[PDB]
Design a protein around this motif. Structure first.
Motif, short mmCIF file in Angstrom:
data_model
loop_
_atom_site.label_atom_id
_atom_site.label_comp_id
_atom_site.label_asym_id
_atom_site.label_seq_id
_atom_site.Cartn_x
_atom_site.Cartn_y
_atom_site.Cartn_z
N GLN D 38 65.71 23.26 -19.00
CA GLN D 38 65.87 24.71 -18.84
C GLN D 38 65.84 25.39 -20.21
OE1 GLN D 38 69.31 26.69 -19.86
NE2 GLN D 38 68.48 28.36 -19.19
N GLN D 39 65.95 24.47 -21.21
CA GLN D 39 65.66 25.31 -22.50
C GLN D 39 63.99 25.36 -22.70
OE1 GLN D 39 68.71 26.77 -23.74
NE2 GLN D 39 67.99 25.99 -25.71
N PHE D 40 63.31 24.45 -22.00
CA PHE D 40 61.93 24.55 -22.07
C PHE D 40 61.34 25.80 -21.30
CE2 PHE D 40 57.69 22.94 -21.27
CZ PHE D 40 57.27 22.47 -22.42
N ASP D 41 61.91 25.96 -20.37
CA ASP D 41 61.23 26.84 -19.26
C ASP D 41 61.27 28.43 -19.89
OD1 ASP D 41 60.46 24.86 -17.46
OD2 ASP D 41 62.27 25.18 -16.37
N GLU D 42 62.14 28.64 -20.60
CA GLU D 42 62.05 30.23 -21.25
C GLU D 42 61.20 30.04 -22.30
OE1 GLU D 42 63.74 32.62 -20.68
OE2 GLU D 42 62.93 33.98 -22.41
N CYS D 43 60.85 29.30 -23.28
CA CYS D 43 59.75 29.04 -24.19
C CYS D 43 58.36 29.12 -23.51
CB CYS D 43 59.83 27.82 -25.05
SG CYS D 43 58.53 27.59 -26.09
N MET D 44 58.32 28.32 -22.43
CA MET D 44 57.04 28.13 -21.79
C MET D 44 56.74 29.28 -20.84
SD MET D 44 54.59 26.71 -21.73
CE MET D 44 54.78 25.25 -22.55
N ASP D 45 57.73 30.06 -20.47
CA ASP D 45 57.62 31.34 -19.69
C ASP D 45 57.09 32.44 -20.62
OD1 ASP D 45 57.94 30.32 -17.20
OD2 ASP D 45 60.21 30.87 -17.49
N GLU D 46 57.72 32.68 -21.78
CA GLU D 46 57.16 33.65 -22.64
C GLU D 46 55.80 33.40 -23.12
N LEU D 47 55.53 31.99 -23.30
CA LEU D 47 54.21 31.67 -23.80
C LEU D 47 53.38 31.98 -22.79
CD1 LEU D 47 52.33 28.98 -24.56
CD2 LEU D 47 53.68 30.13 -26.31
N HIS D 48 53.53 31.64 -21.55
CA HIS D 48 52.69 31.83 -20.20
C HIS D 48 52.49 33.62 -20.35
CE1 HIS D 48 51.53 28.24 -18.64
NE2 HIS D 48 52.50 27.94 -17.76
N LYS D 49 53.39 34.22 -20.57
CA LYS D 49 52.99 35.72 -20.60
C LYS D 49 52.00 36.34 -21.68
CE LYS D 49 56.82 37.87 -21.34
NZ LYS D 49 58.34 37.94 -21.56
N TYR D 50 52.06 35.70 -22.74
CA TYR D 50 51.07 36.12 -23.72
C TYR D 50 49.50 35.35 -23.56
CZ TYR D 50 54.98 38.04 -26.04
OH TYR D 50 56.35 38.73 -26.43
N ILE D 51 49.37 34.09 -23.25
CA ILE D 51 48.14 33.54 -23.01
C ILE D 51 47.92 33.34 -21.78
CG2 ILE D 51 47.02 31.46 -23.65
CD1 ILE D 51 47.72 31.73 -26.11
N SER D 52 46.38 33.65 -21.29
CA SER D 52 45.86 33.69 -19.88
C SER D 52 46.28 32.49 -19.22
CB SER D 52 44.56 34.18 -19.93
OG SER D 52 43.74 33.78 -18.65
N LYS D 53 46.56 32.60 -17.90
CA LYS D 53 46.86 31.30 -17.27
C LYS D 53 45.63 30.17 -17.15
CE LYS D 53 50.27 30.78 -14.62
NZ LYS D 53 49.70 31.98 -14.15
N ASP D 54 44.40 30.77 -17.01
CA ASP D 54 43.41 29.69 -16.90
C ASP D 54 43.27 29.00 -18.13
OD1 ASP D 54 40.80 28.43 -17.07
OD2 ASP D 54 39.92 30.35 -17.20
N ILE D 55 43.54 29.81 -19.26
CA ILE D 55 43.17 28.92 -20.87
C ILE D 55 44.59 27.71 -20.87
CG2 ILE D 55 44.23 29.56 -23.16
CD1 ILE D 55 41.06 30.15 -21.19
N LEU D 56 45.70 28.21 -20.44
CA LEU D 56 46.89 27.11 -20.72
C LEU D 56 47.51 26.94 -19.45
CD1 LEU D 56 49.66 27.64 -23.37
CD2 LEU D 56 49.79 26.51 -21.11
#
Lengths: 81, 116, 161, 239, 544
Positions: D38-56
């Protein structure tokens, strides 16, 4: 199973096949040594300790006879026999 | 020194946390109190961080007996043969070809103890 | 090993304490006032590790001089046959009559055995002074327990070594 | 410079001489572990917003341990910056749990910390410091890289200096399934090597015949050492 | 009935298979099972029963997944699949054979290249495979066969004869076991040259014109100048012969004469006392030369005879740490050394330290779970103390770093966390059956504070007195530790700590135990309380 050269799976049948007839009795009656046919069915259990059955040291590296005087004349460590 | 390094590693592991350890790591000495006692145990003279003329090279195969061994100066054995074909190979430069027979010994025993 | 250049203020037990963790050790006798000692190991490998590791290390504030050097018998033999200056020829040190299978060289154990004799372990060992012991299971317990003993007794002064 | 990712990132945008156009056929896989999801998913969700889904993409494993989740992080076709951004964020976040439990802001990286981890590249790279290769890498196809303990700004700087040099080529479409399968094979092997730690003597070794095979040779060995000590005692003895 | 059903209803098959499935890591059972299945198909060809070929493949694949360093069985399994019709599978068999050896085995490259000459039929691809084999296993001391095989392919395929001179000049500087053959090739091939334009096959023309003062384009009488050329090139080859002869003869006389066994053998075999010593000396030699392919190769070469011993797994890992500074390399060497070595404790103790220094703590926290789950949450009851103590130190390091400090003056609670103190107490409760009780006691008295020492004195020492257990009451180290806890406490003054010891510890020890307790307690009272020594002597005098 690899180095015998008669039990190899690729050239295995060819070596036995091309042994030749030897239709000469005296051809086999010439030599009186042992054949030493190492079977394919051999296992790990025989010769459990390789040093105790008497081993041979590997031969020293052969050098050119024309340049045989350029060798270092004395070794480093006193070795016996 | 072995007793102190063993007991200090046993003490540090049970009395210190990661927030202290990761701030204890400094790079110019590559010191780290978890692993550095494990490396400094049997050798006391341990520094943590022109090779052909050191006293570890010259007596490599045989300790105490020093011989300058002949070697080729520009050897190509590290170079692959996929890259030797690109340009032709130079002649070898040699060093220490006079000394294939000279071997020399610092005999502390005879000098300082037999002949006093 | 011939350890030369000693302070002459160093004992034999204090000299055994330096040279012991390199490997097991047959004897550590030193002459009375020649400012040089003599250490002999069981292994050639441990003695070479000692000459590598302890070269030039200061024992009681004098940079020490490590090299090879014969025993006490051979030294008395060479001294009398050098005062008679006749031959001074030496004799080769005795071999271990190998193949030897138990022993893993440069290894120390300080003090009923049903060991499974497998390769990774150690089976036989030389006792510390001397005889040969079958290696027990509990080497680390006896070793660690003796070093806690050595720390708590050495801090108060009952062994300078 | 500062310890905010965005100032370092805008620096590395401005000064890096075509820091934009990406690397041909470039894929980087970094397997990372976390205790809690649950700590990981917040970082990865904000990270997903900035970088294109195909890229990461983030590939979860099968949750075989069920305690430590092992998420693969894959950056396909990244630029010279996207790599710096994702690596700085994730390399800080997986070390945020131990050292700075109170700060809690997933794009600002506090100054007590240093970035340390490892990533995998394919072997078919041509490179023609703070990031070194490894010798004796364990996955049969990929080249493990080590990053050793730098600031955030030196991490950005050295990642850009590294990915300028490197030159990728021509992997398969699903090479990532190959890496997933291979890394899971390797850690299944070392887990099943730790499960053999009690079972050495008689568990699977037929000790009943091994002892009878190597009892006399231990006995002759002990004889030879006793003879050795008596011989050496007679050699040292002045007599 | 056919071969498969007839084989299954045989009586020997159940016995051989039950002996393999009971004792997996004994090799002779595997080889007996394997020879029986292969002999049970006496003609092996493309038409034999597919339910039986699937079983021969499962037997070989499972043996080689158990014993991955068996060189000859990768060759044999690949040659079996080459007989059965598909070379596509035999490529994969050789390549997993090379990969389990981490590409540094000489025999699998030699047999893989004598295989691949027949079936790869594309010249640049076969030469890329020879360049791969060169860069991994080229500098091997016995790799005369590899280089001679490579020169055979170069002299049969190529029409240029430049690549032969190139490769042969690289052979001339490698210290091989049989380098005199590769010198005699060069000597007769210089002597078989015919005119001055072919001297540029060796080196460049300007290198000749500078170093040997020889002009290729000397036009004129070219008899004497060519003979002068051959004599000067033969002199340079004589000097390079001296250098390679010295290095070969030195390696052979010192190190390579003494190794007799170069093969994997089996996990139940023992390596001599001679060869452990000469492999340690020969690796220590190799590290000095600073050639890196030869060093990785000599470590992977020494892991054939004593892979299981683990002396090399640690020496190779410490070489990657402190000489080349490649620390993930040394983590991976120990991760691969867990799979082979039978004495895992020293590798796991070094491994924990390597993982902690890399700042990869979640890998540590996950690695400890495999030990505390491999004994099924009962590592507190392990027979060997060496596993438990190395476990407990790093579990204490992690447990301090998770939960913040519970006591005052900034003290991480060490062994006395309620999750770890239970693991301590279930081992102190076994009382003589488990070894290493004294070190648990002696590592529980370093607190030196008020409430920490008060916790320890209220929970372990007082409770051993309250149960009245005879092993610890008998043992003098227990009372030495229970005095040394109070005396090094920095919360008391001198008078109250001395009065507490002499008035309320020393009365409690039973006079029937005094012959064992007094030699350990006397050293304490002689070190710290020389004044109160007469009280202790009169508490245990021989006459009441």
């Amino acid at each position: 199973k690899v180095f015998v050269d008669a039990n190899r799976f690729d050239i295995g049948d060819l070596v036995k096949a091309s042994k030749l007839p030897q239709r000469a009795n005296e051809k086999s009656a010439h030599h009186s040594f042992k054949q030493t046919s190492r079977s394919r069915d051999e296992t790990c259990e025989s010769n459990p300790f390789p040093r105790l059955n008497n081993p041979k040291k590997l031969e020293p590296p052969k050098i050119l006879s024309q340049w045989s005087n350029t060798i270092p004349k004395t070794s480093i460590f006193y070795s016996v026999d | 020194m072995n007793d102190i390094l063993t007991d200090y590693k046993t003490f540090y592991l049970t009395h210190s946390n990661i927030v202290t350890y990761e701030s204890s790591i400094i790079d110019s000495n590559t010191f780290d109190p978890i692993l550095y006692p494990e490396l400094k145990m049997s050798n006391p003279k341990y520094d943590p961080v022109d090779w052909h003329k050191k006293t570890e090279w010259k007596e490599a195969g045989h300790i105490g007996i020093t011989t300058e061994r002949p070697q080729i100066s520009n050897s190509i054995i590290e170079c692959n043969s996929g890259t030797l074909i690109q340009k032709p190979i130079s002649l070898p430069n040699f060093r220490n070809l006079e000394k294939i027979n000279q071997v020399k010994i610092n005999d502390l025993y005879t000098e300082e103890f037999l002949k006093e | 090993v011939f350890i030369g250049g000693l302070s002459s203020l160093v004992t034999e037990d204090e000299l055994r304490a330096y040279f012991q963790p390199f490997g097991t050790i047959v004897y550590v006798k030193i002459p009375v006032g020649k400012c040089c000692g003599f250490v002999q190991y069981v292994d050639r490998l441990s003695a070479e590790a000692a000459i590598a590791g302890m070269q030039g290390f200061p024992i009681a504030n004098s940079r020490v001089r490590l090299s090879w050097g014969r025993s006490a018998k051979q030294t008395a033999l060479l001294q009398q046959a050098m005062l008679s200056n006749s031959l001074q020829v030496q004799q080769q040190q005795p071999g271990l009559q190998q193949p030897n299978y138990g022993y893993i060289p440069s290894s120390t154990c300080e003090a009923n055995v049903s060991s499974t004799m497998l390769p990774g372990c150690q089976i036989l060992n030389y006792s510390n002074p001397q005889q040969v012991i079958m290696q027990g299971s509990e080497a680390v317990v006896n070793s660690t327990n003796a070093m806690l003993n050595r720390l708590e007794q050495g801090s108060n002064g009952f062994m300078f070594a | 410079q500062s310890f905010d990712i965005w100032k370092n990132l805008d620096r590395i945008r401005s000064t890096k001489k075509n820091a934009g156009q990406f690397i041909k056929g470039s894929l980087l896989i970094l397997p990372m572990r976390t205790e809690d999801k649950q700590q990981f998913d917040e970082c990865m969700d904000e990270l997903h917003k900035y970088i294109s889904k195909d890229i990461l993409r983030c590939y979860p494993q099968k949750e075989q341990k069920d305690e430590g989740m092992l998420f693969y992080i894959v950056l396909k076709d990244f630029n010279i910056l996207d790599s710096c951004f994702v690596l700085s964020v994730l390399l800080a976040f997986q070390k945020r749990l131990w050292m700075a439990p109170s700060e809690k802001s997933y794009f600002r990286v506090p100054k007590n910390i240093n970035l340390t981890g490892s990533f995998y590249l394919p072997k078919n790279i041509e490179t023609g410091s703070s990031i070194v290769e490894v010798g004796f890498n364990v996955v049969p196809d990929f080249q493990q890289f080590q990053v050793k303990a730098c600031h955030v700004s030196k991490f950005m700087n050295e990642l850009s200096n590294f990915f300028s040099q490197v030159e990728f080529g021509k992997c398969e479409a699903n090479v990532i399934n190959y890496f997933k399968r291979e890394y899971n094979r390797t850690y299944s092997q070392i887990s099943l090597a730790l499960y053999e730690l009690p079972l050495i003597g008689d568990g699977l070794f037929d000790i009943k015949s091994y002892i009878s095979k190597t009892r006399p040779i231990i006995e002759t060995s002990k004889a030879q050492m006793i003879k050795h000590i008596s011989e050496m005692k007679a050699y040292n003895e002045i007599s | 009935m056919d071969k498969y059903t007839a084989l299954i209803h045989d009586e020997n098959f159940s016995t051989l298979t039950l002996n393999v499935s009971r004792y997996p890591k004994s090799l002779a059972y595997w080889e007996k099972l394997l020879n029986y299945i292969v002999k049970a198909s006496a003609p092996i060809c493309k038409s034999t029963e597919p339910q039986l070929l699937k079983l021969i493949r499962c037997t070989y694949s499972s043996m080689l997944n158990e014993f991955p360093y068996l060189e000859n069985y990768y060759i044999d399994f690949a040659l079996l699949e080459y007989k059965l019709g598909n070379v596509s599978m035999s490529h994969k068999i050789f390549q997993r054979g090379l990969q389990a050896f981490n590409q540094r085995s000489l025999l699998l490259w030699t047999s893989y290249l004598k295989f691949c000459n027949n079936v790869i039929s594309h010249q640049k691809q076969l030469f890329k495979k020879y360049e791969t084999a060169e860069e991994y296993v080229g500098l091997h001391f016995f790799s005369g066969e590899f280089w001679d095989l490579y020169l055979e392919q170069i002299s049969s395929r190529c029409t240029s004869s430049k690549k032969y001179w190139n490769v042969l000049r690289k052979i001339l500087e490698i210290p091989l076991h049989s380098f005199s053959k590769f010198y005699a090739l060069w000597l007769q091939r210089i002597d078989d040259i015919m005119d001055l334009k072919q001297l540029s096959q060796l080196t460049s023309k300007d290198e000749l014109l500078k170093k040997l003062k020889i002009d290729i384009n000397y036009s004129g009488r070219k008899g004497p100048y060519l003979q002068d050329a051959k004599k000067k090139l033969k002199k340079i080859t004589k000097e390079m012969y001296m250098v390679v002869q010295y290095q070969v003869l030195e390696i052979y006389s010192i190190f390579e004469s003494k190794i007799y066994i170069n093969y994997y053998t089996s996990p139940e075999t023992l390596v001599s006392s001679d060869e452990i010593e000469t492999w340690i000396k020969y690796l220590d030699y190799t590290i000095t030369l600073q050639t890196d392919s030869l060093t990785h190769l000599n470590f992977q070469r020494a892991l054939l005879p004593l892979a299981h011993y683990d002396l090399v797994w640690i020496k190779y890992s410490k070489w990657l740490i402190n000489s080349k500074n490649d620390l993930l390399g040394a983590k991976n060497v120990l991760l691969m050394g867990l799979k082979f070595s039978l004495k895992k404790t020293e590798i796991i103790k070094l491994l924990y330290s390597v993982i902690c220094k890399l700042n990869e703590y979640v890998l540590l926290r996950n690695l400890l779970e495999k030990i505390e789950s491999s004994y099924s949450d009962n590592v507190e009851n392990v027979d060997d103390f060496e596993i438990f103590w190395d476990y407990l130190q790093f579990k204490t390091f992690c447990q301090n770093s998770l939960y913040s400090s519970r006591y005052s003056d900034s003290q991480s609670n060490g062994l006395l966390n309620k999750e770890l103190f239970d693991k301590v107490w279930k081992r102190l409760s076994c009382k003589e059956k488990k070894s290493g009780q004294e070190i648990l006691l002696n590592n529980l008295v370093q607190f030196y504070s008020k409430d920490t020492v008060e916790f320890v004195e209220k929970n372990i020492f007082q409770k051993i007195i309250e149960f009245g257990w005879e092993y610890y009451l008998q043992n003098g180290m227990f009372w030495n530790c229970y005095c040394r806890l109070i005396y090094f406490d920095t919360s008391r003054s001198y008078l109250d700590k001395r009065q507490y010891i002499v008035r309320k510890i020393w009365p409690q020890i039973d006079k029937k135990f005094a012959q064992s307790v007094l030699p350990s307690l006397t050293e304490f009272c002689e070190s710290y309380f020389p004044e109160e020594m007469d009280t202790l002597e009169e508490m245990f005098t021989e006459e009441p």
